[PDB]
Amino acid sequence: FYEKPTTERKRAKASAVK
Amino acid sequence: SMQDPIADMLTRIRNGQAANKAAVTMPSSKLKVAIANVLKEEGFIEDFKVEGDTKPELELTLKYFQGKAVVESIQRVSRPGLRIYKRKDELPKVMAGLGIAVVSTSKGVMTDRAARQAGLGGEIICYVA
Amino acid sequence: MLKAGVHFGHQTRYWNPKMKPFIFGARNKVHIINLEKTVPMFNEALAELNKIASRKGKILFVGTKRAASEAVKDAALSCDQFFVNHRWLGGMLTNWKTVRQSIKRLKDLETQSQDGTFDKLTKKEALMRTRELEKLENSLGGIKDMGGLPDALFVIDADHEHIAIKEANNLGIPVFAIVDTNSDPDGVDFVIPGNDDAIRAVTLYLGAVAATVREGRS
Amino acid sequence: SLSTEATAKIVSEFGRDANDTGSTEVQVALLTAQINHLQGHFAEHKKDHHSRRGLLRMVSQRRKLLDYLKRKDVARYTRLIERLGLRR
RNA sequence: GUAAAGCGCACGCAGGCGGUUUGUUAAGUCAGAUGUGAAAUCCCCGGGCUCAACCUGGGAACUGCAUCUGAUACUGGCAAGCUUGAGUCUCGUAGAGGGGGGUAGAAUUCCAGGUGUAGCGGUGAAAUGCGUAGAGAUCUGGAGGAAUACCGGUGGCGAAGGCGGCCCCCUGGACGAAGACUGACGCUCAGGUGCGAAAGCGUGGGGAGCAAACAGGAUUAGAUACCCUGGUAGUCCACGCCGUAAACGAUGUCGACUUGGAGGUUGUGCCCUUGAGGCGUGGCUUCCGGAGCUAACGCGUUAAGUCGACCGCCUGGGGAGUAC
């Protein structure tokens, strides 16, 4: 994506952090 | 503060009193101490003492008669950026006289009770209340 | 040397800075209460409890926590007085008319539930109601005597029942708390920087309070 | 850039004594030594914009110290900017 | 912040503000005084019209200006300092901070070779396509261009845009340990200058994939779209331009003050560092949360709290970020 993957890896840190 | 060393002390006095501190410290001045006398003798605060030579730091010992603070709201009026000067008759009254103002009169810094008795207006340092 | 010089503290690191001054300073990763400074608001609370008992104090012994529960029911009885050795039922102060009818219901249980099982309609169904609403009377064990509106309050903690103080101050009843150090002492009335755990300690506190209230009538 | 001895000589002759790094003429001439060095860099690259920010920062601080010389003590100003050729 | 509204970000002239002590001046300021502020209007105490409107006496008022004489706290000037503001040096610590050079290997593609073979691909089924020649598949090599798997992170750096292979050359900041040195050298900044993702343009190269446009095949009621097969500009490089973005933390910069907890990253001081660290201290940083603030969500020592100095902008929706 060149701009999503830094967003999902900085969103799903809402998914898979706790 | 970097451009208003007196609104800075007033902010000290009414930040360190929401937090309910007994005493506050700041780098002193001659005008800061001139104010501190007028505050501490109208009973708005216990007593102070200045100390230091290279860095003479003013420390006021704040007062409060309950959980409530005796100093309700001090307001910096003559801001550098809008300097406010009054005459001997247009001197502000604070809460219709219940609270105190601090002005710089030609015979020094004092309240407005006394600088209105003295017939000599000044430079409105701050409303004390 | 006494109780104060026996119980030390609580609150490893999750501390509440509203009661900042009450601690000497943490040692061994736990906070230590200014134990010596606790007796000036021991004896003052003791004296006022004596005065309230002189006015026939209507005083609560809130004992919601596990261990103090029977450890306080014994007290109120030795205090000839009230307690809540169980959960603080939500609103036992503000919702008083509700528990007013509830204690009417419980007095009905202790008067006519005996009478109902006698001959009224059934044997077995009335027995079921007995064995169930005996649990209701097991609830509300302390308050059950008088018309309500107690004079003052002697809760044994703050955080576990912040709702209790939140109701008594909203109504204007003097909370004679024994704050933990984890707690939130802004709401209480006559805060006591004690330690709420170490059941030995709370037994000592309540024994002193009982000694005061049993003859506060002078 | 500039070396330790290269700054040491500047502090030496332009300071009123050894270890007078702080006097404004020492700072001025040390900054201008560095600027004169870096013109040779920035004539080579011309696409290094994340260093002309630093070059501009020190040219701006050099002008700001120079104006302070001008007000505070004119004689040192007018004796320095010809020892440097400065204030073209 | 989300309602309209923080310039994309810096640097900076003019401008606006300015720590602290003493001396001086007395411009601002303040007090008093003297003139003057036309009359009428306005207000006050009256008076005369049978009352009133109306007329009218005297006062007050005209919040101003100029001159003079005092004060000197605060603001300004001039002079002398001071060290806390700001900056230089000694010293190390970290880093995808830049710019210029090479360099490696995988991976797509293409080409040459060998083996041998009828399908390959493609999707929700399909043809176009590629192929019996030797395709796909396999290993052997060779050319080229473009990006750097793993580490990798709620990580790090940068004024923003942005910056990830490795190594060197030049360089820019930042932070921390003690020190030393200047003495207010400061903050903000209309105009101004410079950087400015991606597209896009200009002149010459390059061009592996990818691919607006364009072709051909399905879909659908229709398909100029999604979908497939090709595919040009562009994407890459140098120089020049463009100047924009949901350029966003939708939070301007700077400073001071104001309960706590848990992490992260990078220095450092002391402690048996025994060590991992414990006790502390810095910086940057993510997440909770009462005070307080908010319409609210929410912010909450990195504030949207309590103040100060400057700058930019807002003023119902559309028309319109449009015409000129």
Brief characterization of the structure:
Chain D: This is Small ribosomal subunit protein uS15. Chain C has six helices and four strands, in the order E-E-H-E-H-H-H-E-H-H.
Mind describing the biggest β-sheet of chain C?
Answer: 2 strands, antiparallel
CA-based gyration radius of chain C: 20 Å
| Percent of residues in helices of chain C | 40-55%
Q: Based on Cα principal axes, name the global outline of chain C.
A: elongated
Textual characterization of the structure:
- The structure is cut from a larger assembly and holds chains A (18 residues), B (129 residues), C (218 residues) and D (88 residues).
- In chain A, 44% of the residues lie in helices and 0% in strands.
- Chain A is mainly α and 18 residues long.
- Chain B has two domains: 1-71, no CATH class; 72-129, no CATH class.
- A four-stranded antiparallel β-sheet of chain B has the order 4-7-5-6. Chain B has a three-stranded antiparallel β-sheet with strand order 1-3-2, with helices on one face.
- In chain B, a hairpin with a 5-residue loop joins β2 (47-51) and β3 (57-61).
- Chain D has 88 residues and is mainly α.
- Chain D has one domain (1-88).
- Chain D starts with a helix and ends in a 5-residue tail after the last helix.
- The chains hardly touch.
- Chain B binds one RNA strand of 324 nucleotides through α1, β1, β5 and β6.
List descriptors.
part of a larger assembly, 4 chains, B: alpha+beta, 2 domains, 20% helix, globular, C: 218 residues, mainly alpha, two-stranded antiparallel sheet, 6 helices, 4% strand, elongated, RNA-binding, ribonucleoprotein (chain D), uS15_NS1_RNA-bd_sf (chain D)
